[PDB]
Structure 1
């Protein structure tokens, strides 16, 4: 929507994850996940707008370590993912994910999710794995006060989005009701699985 494709922010060295994603997540986790409502609470609009700016200027690590409002870092990550010219799960798989997540039989649904994920382009799959492992630690932090369902409600519009750049009002709405379930199944896929995308050799 705003700047560019996910593939444009990753190197070529697996795991292919944008460094903006890596630095944001690391920062958040390095602080212990002690804050309440991570990813739910918005960060000061002015704090978040600067970062987006003085980001291309000075290096990342020094940046984020200085941010007082952690939530501003959460909005930074979320905005970045939301502004990819195409959703993290890609336009061309957007329907496969919703449909797979809609299967009522859990075991059968999980199976269809593994298939949809197997179809993700590598960079998207690595970035997804990394992001998911993170959100599982968040939902398991007794402090954050955010569970899988809450987080799925938030990242629904973020990584799932729609199948086209600009949906009609009716499709947009029906879509938004089906996105949270997609993120829930993904977060239900084991940490033992997602971790495998962090392999290096």
Structure 2
């Protein structure tokens, strides 16, 4: 359940963002921005599984307002993203993103980051844009006690992940050290830059 490519969960109508991602974000923005540890604290797996099956197998929109613990919604969103056949930033651009984020000169790093985003398939680009705008708001909220650095650590394994389906143990440890900076860079890009992909 939910183990397919990002594109399987959206049409080619812009913005190309899966409904599950939009509904989760809307719920989280309404009652999660006041909660400490947002995206760090895990919700009940039983709830995550039930919601996941309704969204992806039954293909209906479950009533998220009925879910008492908003952390289960954060868990659902992370679970959906993390279990895609390939990560949000794709296998093809995994290394490109890490290398871009590693350029010593900041403006040069930012330029390489923009070039990489420009290479993403549309679904990935639009979903990433939507997610970044949302996470900036999570960092911006003083109630979540989650800053850019913390969010980058949570989402590094979630959206950057690895360059291959079955990376060796050592390479995995090396990838994990490099993921956070990629997300920190992405979260720091201009709101207007990301927003342009939302207005169509």
Decide whether aligned partners of structure 1 residues 2 and 174 sit closer, same or farther in structure 2, where only a CA change above 3 A counts: farther
User: Residues of 2 paired with 1:47 and 1:32: CA distance?
Assistant: 17
Preserved CA contact (<8 Å) 1:95 1:163:
yes
Structure-1 separation of matches of 2:60 and 2:190: 30
**Under a length normalisation based on structure 2, what TM-score does the superposition of the two structures give?**
0.95
Contact 1:20–1:60 (CA under 8 A) maintained in structure 2: no
| CA shift in 2, pair 1:81/1:62, >3 Å | closer
Change (3 A) 1:55 1:42: same
Deviations 1:58-79 (A, max 9, x none): 7765521111000000000000
Higher alpha-carbon deviation: 46-55 or 191-200: 46-55
Query: 1:75 and 1:172, CA in 2 relative to 1: closer, same or farther beyond 3 A?
Result: same
Q: Decide which moves more: 46-55 or 145-154.
A: 46-55
Q: Compared with structure 1, are the counterparts of its residues 177 and 28 closer, same or farther at alpha carbon in structure 2 (3 Å cutoff)?
A: same
Rounded to whole Å, the distance in 1 between the matches of 2:109 and 2:29 is 30
CA RMSD of aligned residues (A): 1.6
Give the deviation of 1:131 after TM superposition: 0.3
Q: Tell me how far 1:30 sits from its aligned partner.
A: 1.9
2:54·2:62 contact (CA, 8 Å) conserved in 1? no
Tell me how far 1:189 sits from its aligned partner. 0.5
Higher deviation after alignment, 130-139 or 28-37: 28-37
Conserved 8 A contact 2:2-2:52: no
Structure 1 distance, partners of 2:174, 2:56, is 37
Matches within 5 A, 1:1-201: 3-31=3-31, 33-56=33-56, 62-200=62-200
Alignment deviations for residues 140-194 of structure 1 (CA, whole Å, 9 cap, x no partner): 0010110000000000001000000010001011000000000000001011110
Q: Unaligned regions of 5+ residues in structure 2, if any?
A: none
CA distance in 1, matches of 2:177, 2:59: 38
Over 4 Å off, 4+ runs: 56-62
1:23–1:60 contact (8 Å) kept in structure 2: no
Whether contact under 8 Å (1:42, 1:72) holds in the other structure is: yes
